Nucleic acid binder design. Structure first.
Lengths: 49, 102, 145, 48, 116, 110
RNA sequence: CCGAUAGUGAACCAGUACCGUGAGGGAAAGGUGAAAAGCACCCCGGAAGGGGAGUGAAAUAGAACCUGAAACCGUGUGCUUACAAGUAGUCAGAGCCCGUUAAUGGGUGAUGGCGUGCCUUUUGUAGAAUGAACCGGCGAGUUACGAUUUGAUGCAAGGUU
RNA sequence: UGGGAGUCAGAACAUGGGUGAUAAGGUCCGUGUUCGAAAGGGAAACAGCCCAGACCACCAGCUAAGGUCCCAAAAUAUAUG
RNA sequence: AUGGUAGGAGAGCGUUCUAAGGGCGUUGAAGCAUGAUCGUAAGGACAUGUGGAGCGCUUAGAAGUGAGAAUGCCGGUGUGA
């Protein structure tokens, strides 16, 4: 290949989801968490089991 | 002398020599288009369409296949988090009538 | 935004009419005069401009009510001082200032814009058969059935 | 004592239309000197 | 690599300010109030593109009524008799014929009359 | 032909100096000086010194005759303000505002 | 890699101004050189100007020579615009203009209809529910390192680091 | 079968039928309407009748109805009793 | 035939470097701030100012990445007589 024409294999890379960056991403304000309660809080949620 | 032609989905009143703007036709610039749905030829002698006049064409020449001025379709909802911005340009075609034929 | 005609000043020709209020009902005559005043009977009607003509009502002491509207049907008005509500019946107003009566009926059927207030000033109403506007040569208008 | 809303530029300047200075008198010095206050022998060049 | 927020904020805000030109007072100067107004004005214009079609149809019908009543006809009987005659021309066109060519309008008023 | 002068960082607040600057605007220089002499305001002597400086400029540097000149522009811009803490009240601040006074004078010709 | 809200609180007058009885707390402010060549000289009011003058390849490049921007705010000119009840816009047009990184280009400013936020929180709000001018450091998703589920292979009787 | 969730005031106007004080803008339940993201558009205006799910805009012009002095699409809208 | 604050797999841009290639540049080259173009984007190729020596494009990778509110903090500025 050339170092100016590098190309990954198809379907092998993907961009990560970036949460909380504005309304049109679909993950805008509450960032995927829903509204209140224990699972909305930072470091929240209940231990497994 | 004047006529009422049907083009696009609408109706237009024309006289010889005026420039009109019309929904996009499939012709080229410089060509000659002929409208055949004529509903009313007025002026000196008056012909009234059956729906149409059955004769009755108008010929015009195509200048400028063009695209219209941009409008910005924006809508939102007030305390939901949703809005949509869209751009639009509508295609038109411009013509210059030479000859109405009763 | 294709071909629709709009009038402007230097298109408008306003006329003068004379309507005889003798033996007509108040509301039935007033609807017709209001639409003369707005322009709604001209083919060049356009809403943001003042079309429509001038109307003279001449008799106006002989306008008629039906039923017992002469002694029911009271006009109220308030003066924005407390307690300041005032009233008068329709028959009492007909025999004392009958022109206020007809122009208040007609002016209630016009819009409340600045164009409506301007169009309400094209109306002249007289009790009794004479009027001063001989100079503008008004025509007689018959009320449509 | 407080305003609920801030006043705009246009309301501020509508309030200041009477807030200005009137033009003074000027009966001129005919003998010698600068023009003096009306009906004064004013303290700078008064020759009334 | 730190990225600092330079120059992109100002471009994005300055074009909303330039969209608000001609607006009263602090709506043409300040970003938040000019932004809310530009949102509202996009929404208004979306609504009014649809109300404009109703308004102009209403105006044409009012003019046709006035034209038809000078031949002792309603609008409604005229449009019915024009349908039974088979005549298929617009209300935009009918209103413009009544303004421009009075004689032709009388002509098709007669075709609406005898078809009834 | 235009002469001008500015006076910079004059210690009067600009609202008080625009009031008397509104008197002399567009008048002749001689009657402008007379108006400035018959107003008791704190800023009439400052403005008069700027006006005399601009007439001296016109006579010396451009050789204009000083009996035809009119006051073409006269305005006051804000300079930099100085912040003072008032000890006399309760610890609230007081700004000493200052201004820039520009006068330009001309004969109306070109 | 810190690229100077920085490895630093401090690449400047810094554990200093200042605050506190004391233990202690703890800033702001950084930035020629092309060469001071820093307006001799000279002319009108102290400051500040106007001229010339200059090392000035360029002082609206004058001590704010790191230049140096914006916005808020200004303020002085003007083009159009003055019978009223207002989420100030939007959709329906007389006067005045005139065209780039070019072609229903570029506009500017007057009228009749219709008219509720980043927002948040709510069954429901637009406040008589909450919180709010402009700018910005400048302000809200790594690995020690594991688990489990979605490309390429030594490369498949196969697994090594 | 597996990955990723939100929701548990989940309600509020609507009965269907019913309890309980037949208000409750309180308790069940069977469909509806919104729904929240479906905003809207003709039920004064109202995620609580006619209509909608969305390619999506757009001077198509012509339909669904709830419709038809002045407002303000749209019967001055009549004709008959 | 083609709506969803919670959902999956999407094509893209500001900072940096590789890891490159290829350019604009000390007869000027910027960038940045005032200009008609691109546009849903985020983001870049030709008139004033700037200076007066710094930037783009393409492909790919990495994120002090990621800018209207939090009675947010302030280098802070400035308003409301």
């Amino acid at each position: 290949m050339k170092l100016h024409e590098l190309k990954p294999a198809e379907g092998s890379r993907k961009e990560r989801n970036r949460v909380g960056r504005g309304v049109a991403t679909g993950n805008g304000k509450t960032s995927g968490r829903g509204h209140k309660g224990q699972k909305a809080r930072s470091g929240g949620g209940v231990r497994p089991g | 002398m004047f006529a009422i032609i049907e083009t696009g989905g609408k109706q237009i009143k024309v006289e010889e020599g005026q420039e009109i703007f019309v929904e996009k036709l499939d012709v080229n610039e410089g060509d000659t288009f002929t409208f055949d749905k004529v509903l009313f030829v007025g002026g000196d002698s008056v012909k009234v369409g059956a729906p149409t006049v059955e004769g009755a064409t108008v010929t015009a020449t195509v200048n400028k296949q063009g695209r219209g001025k941009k409008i910005t379709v924006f809508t939102y909802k007030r305390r939901k988090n949703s809005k949509r911005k869209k751009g639009h340009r509508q295609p038109y075609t411009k013509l210059t009538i030479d000859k109405i034929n009763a | 935004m294709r071909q629709t005609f709009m009038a402007n000043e230097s298109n408008i020709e306003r006329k003068w009419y004379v309507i005889d209020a003798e033996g007509q009902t108040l509301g039935r005559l007033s609807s017709e005069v209001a639409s003369i005043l707005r322009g709604k009977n001209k083919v060049t009607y356009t809403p943001h401009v003042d079309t429509g003509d001038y109307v003279i009502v001449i008799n106006a002491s002989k306008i008629e009510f039906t039923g017992n509207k002469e002694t029911d049907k009271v006009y109220y008005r308030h003066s924005n001082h407390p307690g300041g509500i005032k009233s008068i019946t329709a028959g009492e107003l007909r025999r004392t200032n009958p022109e206020r009566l007809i122009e208040n009926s007609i002016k209630g059927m016009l819009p409340s814009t600045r164009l409506g207030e301007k169009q309400g000033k094209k109306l002249f109403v007289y009790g009794g058969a004479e009027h001063p506007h001989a100079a503008q040569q008004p025509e007689n208008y018959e009320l449509r059935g | 004592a407080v305003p609920k809303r801030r006043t705009s530029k246009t309301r501020k300047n509508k309030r200041r239309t009477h807030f200005k200075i009137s033009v003074p008198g000027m009966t001129e010095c005919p003998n010698c000197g600068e023009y003096k206050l009306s009906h004064r022998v004013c303290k700078n060049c008064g020759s009334y | 690599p730190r990225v600092k927020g330079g120059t992109v904020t100002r471009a994005r805000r300055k074009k909303t300010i330039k969209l608000a030109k001609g607006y009263f007072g602090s709506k043409h100067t300040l970003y938040k109030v000019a932004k809310q107004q530009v949102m509202k004005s996009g929404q208004y214009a979306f609504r009014d593109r649809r109300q404009r079609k109703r308004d102009f149809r209403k105006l044409w019908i009012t003019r046709i009524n006035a034209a038809a009543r000078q031949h002792e006809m309603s609008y409604s009987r005229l449009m019915n008799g024009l349908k039974k005659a088979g005549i298929d021309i617009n209300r935009k066109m009918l209103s413009e014929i009544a303004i421009s060519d009075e004689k032709a309008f009388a002509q098709l008023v007669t075709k609406a009359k005898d078809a009834l | 032909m235009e002469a001008k002068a500015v006076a910079r960082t004059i210690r009067i607040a600009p609202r008080k100096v625009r009031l008397v600057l509104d008197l002399i605007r567009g008048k002749n220089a001689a009657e402008a000086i007379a108006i400035l002499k018959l107003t008791n305001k704190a800023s009439s002597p400052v403005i008069e010194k700027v006006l005399m400086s601009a007439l001296a400029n016109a006579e010396h540097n451009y050789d204009m005759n000083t009996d035809e000149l009119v006051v073409k522009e006269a305005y006051a811009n804000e300079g930099p303000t100085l912040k003072r803490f008032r000890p006399q009240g309760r610890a609230s601040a007081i700004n000493k505002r200052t201004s820039h006074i520009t006068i330009v004078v001309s004969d109306g010709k070109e």
